[PDB]
Design a protein around this ligand. Structure first.
Ligand SMILES: [Ca+2]
Ligand SMILES: [Ca+2]
Ligand SMILES: [Ca+2]
Ligand SMILES: [Ca+2]
Ligand SMILES: [Ca+2]
Ligand SMILES: [Cl-]
Lengths: 256, 255, 249, 255, 255
C-alpha cells in the first residue's frame, strides 16, 4: 500500500491550528487565515490557508513523522488558488529536514526541496523546482510556465530513485527529465544519489506576497504516483467545475 | 595461487560490461555504482549498491569456469549496510556455467550460497548453503553476522577434506566438517560433498526492504593466505578512515 | 573489598522487601521475578523482568549510604534483552540518599547513570552520565552496546584520579579520563552520598531481565563476581537457546 | 596526512644512502639487508637484520625535521625476532636534529624511545620512554611484548591532549594519559610534556645476544588512520604467508 | 577612568570561570594557560596560549555591557607569537551583549575586530574592522604588524569625533578619520559611525596553522592615558627580561 507521509485538507474546523506553527524569526510576518474565499466548489471542502495581508513575508510550517525518500519515489502535491489575481508573489512549498526549528523558519533556512508557482509581473510565471545539493540551492534549468488565473490549480512534483522527475499541473504532465541533465549539479555522469535526502520532517510555506488572498489546500506527500493522481482527482478534480460555475455566475451579476 | 574472479569496480563504468541483469522478471531492483555517504576512499570504496526499496535483485558476473575438486575453494567479498538495514540479504551465490544469466532468479539452481542475512532483531545470520542431491542444505550452526553501518569482510573457505571455515573481518568465527554441520546424509559419509564440477557465475540474487547495501571487493581463489592478504589490502585499508569520516558526520548531525 | 550493594534475587520473594515501586505515576509498568524462557539455571538466573509493553518503569533499592571520595567506585549488573528489543533502556541510576523512592521518576536528580540504551537499528549505545553543577553530562565517546537476546555483563569503573573504564562481558571496551571524555563546566568523579540504585526507564517491547547487581570499591572483586555470575550463566544459556531455536525451525 | 618518515627497503641497496652507521665505537655489530629464512614475500619482507651475536648496534636515518607540538605523533615499525631471541632490544629512538649520527650511542640524548625489549624469562616488555627535564622517564604500566619468531607491528600514538595509545599488530594493548602513567611531576600538571621542538633522526641503538632480528616498514606520521592503513598494507600482507612458509619448514625439520 | 574589562590571568586557574568555550563546533582548538618557554616573569607572563595546530579557536569573556557613544574607546592587549608563526590570527573581537558565547564562531556578528594577522611572506597586517550597515568594513591603510617571537602591545583608540589611532608597543603607527580610512559611504557625512549601542563580550575567534601564540594583559577602557600606563606596567615590564632570557637560550642552542 502507498505511504502517506503528510496529508492536509483543513476539513476539521480549527484543528489545523494545532498542526501548523508560525515562525517568530521576524515580528512582522503576514498571517494565514482559514478560508474558502468568495467563490468555491464547496464552501467547506475548499477551505485552505489564505494569505491575509498585503506586501508581507509569510512563514508557517507543519511537521510530520520524518522519512527518507532513499530507494523510493517521492511525490509532493498541493492546490494553489490565486483568487485575488496576483501581481507578484510566491505559491510554492518547501520540504525541510527535521532539524529545522519551525519557530525560526525564514527565507534563508536550509531546505531540501522547493517546489511550485512563482509570479512576478508580466514577465514571470514560472514553476520552481529547486534541489539543495552540496550546500547550494540549485534551480531547474527548464522553463515551466505556471497558471495565473483566479481558479484552483493542482501542482505535482514526482522524484524517482533513478534520478528522473516529472512536473504536473492539473494532473497532466508539463515537464520531465533527469536531474543530471535539467540542473547543474556537477561534471560528468552525475552521482546517482542526488535525488535522495536522509530526512524530511517539515513542510513550509515560506514566501513573499504583494497582493494577498492566495489559498493553499489539499497538501499530499506520498511515495505513490498513482495515489497522488487519485487524490488529485478527488480534490482538485472535485473542486474544478463547480468553482468555475459559481465564478461565472458572479462575473455575470457583476457586469449587470 | 589461482584467481578465478576478482571485482573491485575500480575502472569507472567498466563493470557494466562484466555483469548481466536477469530479465526473469520486469520489476527487479537496480544496482548502481556508489561509495555512499561515507567511505574510507571515495573511489576505492565504490561498489554495487541496491537502489530501490522492497525489491528483488538479480545481477551476475561470469568467469572462466573451474572446479574445486581436489582443491581449496575460497569465496570472499565486502558488504556494507549503510542504510541500517531492517530486512534484506547480503549473500552471494556461486552457479554452474549452465546458468542462463538473463533468467537468473530465486529458484535458479546454484552450487553454493554464502553470506549475511538480516530480518528484524531476530535474524542476524550467516548463510552457508550447499546444493546436494537436488536439495539446498542449510548449515546447522548459528553464525551471527554483522549488523552495523560499516564495511565488513565475509570469507568462506572450503577444503578437499570436507572441512570448512567462515571468517568475518579476517578472523575465524566458525569451523568444522561438512558431514557434521549439515544434514546431507543419515551417517558418514560421501567424501566428495564439498566438490562441484563447474563454477561459472557469481550472482547477487536477493531481497531487500530498506535499500542502500554496497557490495565490493569480490574474490574467488584457491589460496587462503592470498584471500587474507587481499582482505587486508581492501577491507583493511577501508576500515579506519571509513569509521573516522562517519564519526565526524555523526557529530555534525548532533549540532 | 567493600560491598555496598549486592542483589542476585536468590531467596525467593525476599526481594520484595528490598525494592520499592515509585508512585509518581499510576501507570508504571510492573517488574516481575523471572528467569524467562531460556536460561543457564532456572533458579540462579531469576531477575527483575519488565512485564508490560510501552511503559515507563521505576523501581529502586536502598542501601547503607556511602561516598566514593578517595576511592574506586564499581557499578556492575547483567542485562538480558530476551525479547529481541526494538526500543528500550537497560541502564541503572545511582542516586543520593535524599531521593524519595516512592516519587522516583525520569527527572529525579541522580549522581550517575550507566548502561545500554537501544532504539531502532540506529542506536545501540552505552550511556555513561555524570551529574555535575546541575547538569547531566553525557559521555562524548561512542560505546556500542550488545543487542542480541543473551545475558550481558555491564561494568563501570570510576577511579579517584578521574580515570574511568567501561567493560562489557568482563572485557574492556572503553577507557580514559573524565576531563577529556566529557565536557564538564579536581574531584569531578566524587559524590558525597550514594543511597539508592534505581531502574528508571522506558521500554516498547518488554521482557528485559536484570540480575546480579553489584556496587563495590574493588575492580578485581567485581571481575570475580562477574565470572561467578554472568560467567556461569553464559554457556548453558546459549546451549538451551540453540536447542529451542532448532525445535522452532 | 603528513608522512615525516617511511622506510620499507624496497629499492635494492638504496637504503645504504639513507642510513648512517655510528663510528662512536669500532666494534658495533653490522646490519644487513635480509628477508631471513622464512617470509611472506622474499622481496617485500626485506629489512635491516642484526648480523652478529653479543653486540651493540647503532644505525640511524635522518628526515626533514618536524615538531609534534599541537599535533598527533605516530611512530610505527615491524619487528621479527626470527632467531627466537634470548636477550636483546627491538626498539627505536627518536632524536632531535642536533644528534651527530656518526657519534650515536647508548648515552646519546633522545626525545622518545619505543618498542619491545626481551631479556630472559622475566622480561618481555614494551618500553615507552619520554625524555623530560633531563631525565628518561619510563612508563609505569606493564606492557607485554611479543616473543615468538614472527613479524609483529608496533605502534605508538601520542596526542596533544597528553593522551597516548600503544598498539601491537594494529590492536590496542595500552592507553592513558602521560600525567598518570609516568612520574614526570608530583601532581598534574604541564600540559606540554608530550611535545618536542624537533625530531630529525630515527635510530636503532641497542644491544643483542642472539642476533637475527629484522626491522622493516618504519613509519612516522601525524595520522592514526593512515598508520593503521599502512600497517594492514605491510604487516597485514606479510602475516599469513609468513606463517604458512614457517609451518612447512617446521614440518620438514621434524622429519 | 572607566575600566570595562581587564584580564591578566594572575590568579591561578581563576580565568576558567571568566571565559567560555564556544560549542558551535566539536573540534575547536583549546587555549591553555602558559608563559611558554621564555618570558620576563614566569608567573606574570602567563596568558592564553593556542595549544593545537591547524585549528579554529573560539573563547570569550563577558563583562558589564557599555556603549562608547559620546566617549573614547580603547582596546588593548599583548600578543606573543613564540612559535614563529607561519599563518594565523592574533586579533580580538568586540561583540554586542546579544552574542551567545556558547555558539560564537567566525560568522557571529561583531561590532569591531582588531589586531595582527599573519599569513605567509605577503601578509603581516593589523586589522581594524568596523561593522556598519551589516557589512564588515576593512581599514584601507596598510599597517604592518610585528612578526618576531617576542611580546607586543596592540592598542586601538576610537574617539567620538570619528578619529582613531593605532599603536604598537605604546607608540603610534597609524591615525586618521573613519570617514577617510574606510569606505563606509561614497562621501562624507555620518558622524556616528564610531559608535555602538553595546559591547558585552570580547572574543578570541580565529584560525591558526602553527600554534603557540600567547595572549595576555587585555584592557578595555575609555582613557588613552590609562591605557598607556597599563601598557608600560605590563608589556613594558615584560620586554627586557623576556629578550634577555631568549638571547641566553639562543646562545645555548648555538653551542
Ligand atoms: Ca480544504
Ligand atoms: Ca571498490
Ligand atoms: Ca539471579
Ligand atoms: Ca621491507
Ligand atoms: Ca599574565
Ligand atoms: Cl514476582
Amino acid at each position: 500500500e502507498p505511504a502517506v507521509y503528510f496529508k492536509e485538507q483543513f476539513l476539521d474546523g480549527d484543528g489545523w491550528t494545532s498542526r501548523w506553527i508560525e515562525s517568530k524569526h521576524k515580528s512582522d510576518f503576514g498571517k494565514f487565515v482559514l478560508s474558502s474565499g468568495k467563490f468555491y466548489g464547496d464552501e467547506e471542502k475548499d477551505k485552505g490557508l489564505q494569505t491575509s495581508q498585503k506586501a508581507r513575508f509569510y512563514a508557517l510550517s507543519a511537521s510530520f513523522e520524518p522519512f527518507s525518500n532513499k530507494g523510493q519515489t517521492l511525490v509532493v502535491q498541493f492546490t494553489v488558488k490565486h483568487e485575488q489575481n496576483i501581481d507578484c508573489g510566491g505559491g510554492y512549498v518547501k520540504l525541510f529536514p527535521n532539524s529545522l526549528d519551525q519557530t525560526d523558519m525564514h527565507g534563508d533556512s536550509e531546505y531540501n526541496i522547493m517546489f511550485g508557482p512563482d509570479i512576478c509581473g508580466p514577465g514571470t510565471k514560472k514553476v520552481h523546482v529547486i534541489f539543495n545539493y552540496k550546500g547550494k540551492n540549485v534551480l531547474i534549468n527548464k522553463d515551466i510556465r505556471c497558471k495565473d488565473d483566479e481558479f484552483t490549480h493542482l501542482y505535482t512534483l514526482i522524484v524517482r530513485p533513478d534520478n528522473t522527475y516529472e512536473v504536473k499541473i492539473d494532473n497532466s504532465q508539463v515537464e520531465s527529465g533527469s536531474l543530471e541533465d535539467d540542473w547543474d549539479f556537477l561534471p560528468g555522469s552525475g552521482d546517482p544519489s542526488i535525488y535522495a535526502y536522509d530526512n524530511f520532517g517539515v513542510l513550509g510555506l515560506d514566501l513573499w506576497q504583494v497582493k494577498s488572498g492566495t489559498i493553499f489546500d489539499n497538501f499530499l506527500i506520498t511515495n505513490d504516483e498513482a495515489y497522488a493522481e487519485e487524490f488529485g482527482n478527488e480534490t482538485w478534480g472535485v473542486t474544478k467545475a463547480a468553482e468555475k460555475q459559481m465564478k461565472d455566475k458572479q462575473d455575470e451579476e457583476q457586469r449587470l
